[PDB]
Amino acid sequence: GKYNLILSEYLSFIYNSQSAVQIPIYYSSNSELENRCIEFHSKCLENSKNGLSLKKLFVEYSDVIENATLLSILSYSYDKYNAVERKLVKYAKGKPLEADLTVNELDYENNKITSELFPTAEEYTDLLMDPAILTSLSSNLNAVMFWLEKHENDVAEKLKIYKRRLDLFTIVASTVNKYGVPRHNAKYRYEYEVMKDKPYYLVTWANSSIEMLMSVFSHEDYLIARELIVLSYSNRSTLAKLVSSPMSILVALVDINGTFITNEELELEFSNKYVRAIVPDQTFDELKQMLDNMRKAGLTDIPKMIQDWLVDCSIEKFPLMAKIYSWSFHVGFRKQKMLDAALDQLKTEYTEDVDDEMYREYTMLIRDEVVKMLEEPVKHDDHLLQDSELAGLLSMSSASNGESRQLKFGRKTIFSTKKNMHVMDDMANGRYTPGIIPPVNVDKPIPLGRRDVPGRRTRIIFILPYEYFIAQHAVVEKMLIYAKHTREYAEFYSQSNQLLSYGDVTRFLSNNSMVLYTDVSQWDSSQHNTQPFRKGIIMGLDMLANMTNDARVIQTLNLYKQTQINLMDSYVQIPDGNVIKKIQYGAVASGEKQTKAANSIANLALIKTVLSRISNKYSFATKIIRVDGDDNYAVLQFNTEVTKQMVQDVSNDVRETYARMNTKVKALVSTVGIEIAKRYIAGGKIFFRAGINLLNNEKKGQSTQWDQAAVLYSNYIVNRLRGFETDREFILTKIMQMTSVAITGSLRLFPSERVLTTNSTFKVFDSEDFIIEYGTTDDEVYIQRAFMSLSSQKSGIADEIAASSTFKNYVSRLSEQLLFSKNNIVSRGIALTEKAKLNSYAPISLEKRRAQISALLTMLQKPVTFKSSKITINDILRDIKPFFTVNEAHLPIQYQKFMPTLPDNVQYIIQCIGSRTYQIEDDGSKSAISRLISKYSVYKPSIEELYKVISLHENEIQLYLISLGIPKIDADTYVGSKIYSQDKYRILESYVYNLLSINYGCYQLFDFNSPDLEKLIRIPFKGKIPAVTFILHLYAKLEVINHAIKNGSWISLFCNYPKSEMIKLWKKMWNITSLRSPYTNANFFQ
Amino acid sequence: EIKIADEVKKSNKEESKQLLEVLKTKEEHQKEVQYEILQ
Amino acid sequence: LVSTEAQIQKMSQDLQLEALTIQSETQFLTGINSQAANDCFKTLIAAMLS
């Protein structure tokens, strides 16, 4: 209830003019008071439209100002161009910055003037420094200046922060004011005509530096930020890679005193085990060389901070390092050229000096692993393999973005990347031919996409036709299903919605064991992902072909085989300016349904093969192996205690044993710690990487101005929990400026806290971080009922595409390829279902969401709507609340810290109740209705749709499920069986969980199965209305948790809920009209 | 719409609300099983 | 007279009227008001006299 004041102050500061007037608009759920709000509105519009003073009416309608609820504030201020500079001149009295062209290796990667690299605009491209975000540099500068101005009179520790950040913004703005501000167009791009006479890499550097200096709360933060901002102005290729590299060695220096374990995918069972740190000497020499490079780059304070820690090597001073490890990834992306980014991968050293004893075993192990995956379904003749064509054709929506191709749906032209749409086009024109897999050769090389991530190399992405997906789909789904229960596939061991994300190293760490962990992300152009890898799979397919008797299955397997034949020789379109290069690359990368699990297989075979060579010199028992994409780790135990010399010799043997297969590696062996892309451990304590740029993005998405603010808030919350903390008021300023909308040149609207923080398709953030807010009031209920009426909108593009002839042909072909003779009873159902997977195409979503925002805006302008009784969540909570009673409690501390970097209140909760131990289905995947969909398809259907579908009669359930690819007999059996009644409750569980972010954010980290939380939640049991007692216990838990988060202290509860209200609510249960935005979720693991 | 005296219908007791809600559920279940057998 | 709710609540709790399941026991609550008690009391005696 504080945000709107900051909004008002932002408006007053940014505009400042006599002509700048400020126009609130209010609402109340009570008619008479609402008409007085309407009156105030009216009179304000008039007064605005007559240059009359507004300050007089504000007393007359005092009641509305005190008790009614605000919506938004309008603003009439003219163009008044270039006022940002006219304000900014004062904060730029420092010295500007000079580039240094002889730092980056390349020529165009220096921060020199555009004209020195692109004299003509016809060869200009802003894509090497495009922020790719619908928010301006000017927005950032205005926000910083507003923060600095309002915090210009404080006298505390805050002032010690303020002087520091003021100096940082001085350093930045001197450099900016030296030349000027680039001006955004309507699309938030930056054209040639502003950058023609200015440095090319000023924008990303500026934004990244603003984000960093806005995340300063301490002295070391100031040192680090000043030491990166001033060097990131020139160095743009060897900086985040530099400071983020030693961490991998540092984790091998922290003694464990106390540990965490994993059992099943979120279980913990702590251990007081102590483990020393047997680090060799030569890795210190390596580390010393790395610090010499660090100092050689122009870094002074942060080596000293890295140097004074080694005197003790303690874990209490260690979070600084972790903090440092996150300060490296908030400098921006290294958006270099497609060519030079491919050549990070396309350097090959293929040699007729590798072993042959190794590759044959490698090939065989891949073959054997494949056979273990596929023995059962290939043999028992599963339906999903026979009809693999139809399976992939349904599951196209869960695929990659194919190359743009010109379509026509009746009377339009489309350049879609979605392969389902490609299929729709090719069926009509006789071009659909899935059995004949295209070659990939000189006559038709392959396109590319670029998988980027800062501080590392650029990975490549295949962008293929739609036959490759269809071939790989069914076989890869059975392989993944097999890997759900296999432990060693770290990407895929789960229980249908989880990953082993807290690792499985710490079981067998001891004084006798060691662990070798290894980054394997560069192993795409390598000689072990070419020929042997493919041929092992070919061999497995031969065996599997002899392991079935049906012909459809053998054909499907032969098509998958033929796909691997074509992938063994594969060329690659790569432009460079005007001319086009094509390079032989017959190997593996991402952009495929198969790449992930198959790379995991190949790394597993590789490490199993290598690890049987250390056996020539050591006796050990392989206890555990894990492989997940861009990393892999294996633990191993000895007959004795570990020494430095065994570590050194093992490392040399591992390095040379990879060299025997012609494979480069920075081999890393340790005893207590690991480092990988997504996480790392020191001293039996899990830390995480907070490297998600907020004000700069990887590539250019498709979301609106609105939703990118929500994405940024989720990333903000995440990074805060990780450790990287930014000052929240700046973020709120960005959110309001990104939700601000221009109705004319001078009219602009700004919504309020009570529109943006309400559970709908328009939620963006919360008034108090780590806490969703609900509505006990009339007013939040009122607007939630209003916004649900408006969330449902239309897309004319989708309506006209579904009315053409080709779509109709596609629906007909789906039917007669699946079932026939109900052409007007189910086929229409299948069209309505195909509509559910046209929405992946982005412009449809933009049409629909822009329509939602405009419909929202035409009642943000004018007064409010009653919305006609449509029941939602706050209606229920309104009725649950008046039979509560709170009382002060006092819980003790009995749970262990294992995420130090958290804010102290969340940690206090974790340090008093447990951390989560299960993961209950956000999708309802284990639900008996969903185990059909995961059997005949991959398709999601959103929990809104399922929660709705179950509310209907037993007739249209059959239509809706058969329309999702499922056959008719099992649907009829499901309805006759009466299993939906055994699944109303699970679906509603998942629904309510999706509505309230229970599996999305901070609430993913908390134990609701605790005995300590439960004894506070004293709601007696009634029985035979399970939903009510369920929601009551859940909501009471949420009350206690929100009180804990927002105030630190604890409370109890009690609800002697009357049976009358139990029954009144039981009927309100399965008629809920509520919804939560996809863009608002904050997955802690990305 | 309930088969009970007038001073009970306009009441505020717990038992009265309980009676009304329960018998509304009885009537709705009864009408729905009739709709079943008629379809 | 006894209050109608004061007797009906006792009757209802004595009969344990399950909500979900169908029962012959709901029909026992049919016509339990006052203004019927007086009707019977005024009918029987007048009939036996006449």
Add this chain to the structure above:
Amino acid sequence: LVSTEAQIQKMSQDLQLEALTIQSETQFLTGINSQAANDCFKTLIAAMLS
């Protein structure tokens, strides 16, 4: 004393109530609170003395 809310937990779990049934046992919980136990404990002794 024992806390009212925990004792009501125990009593509710022990009686095996049913939310879709006019139970007689539902009325056992009316007025269990403290401020009455004190009042009753005080009233009895005061009356027996006086």
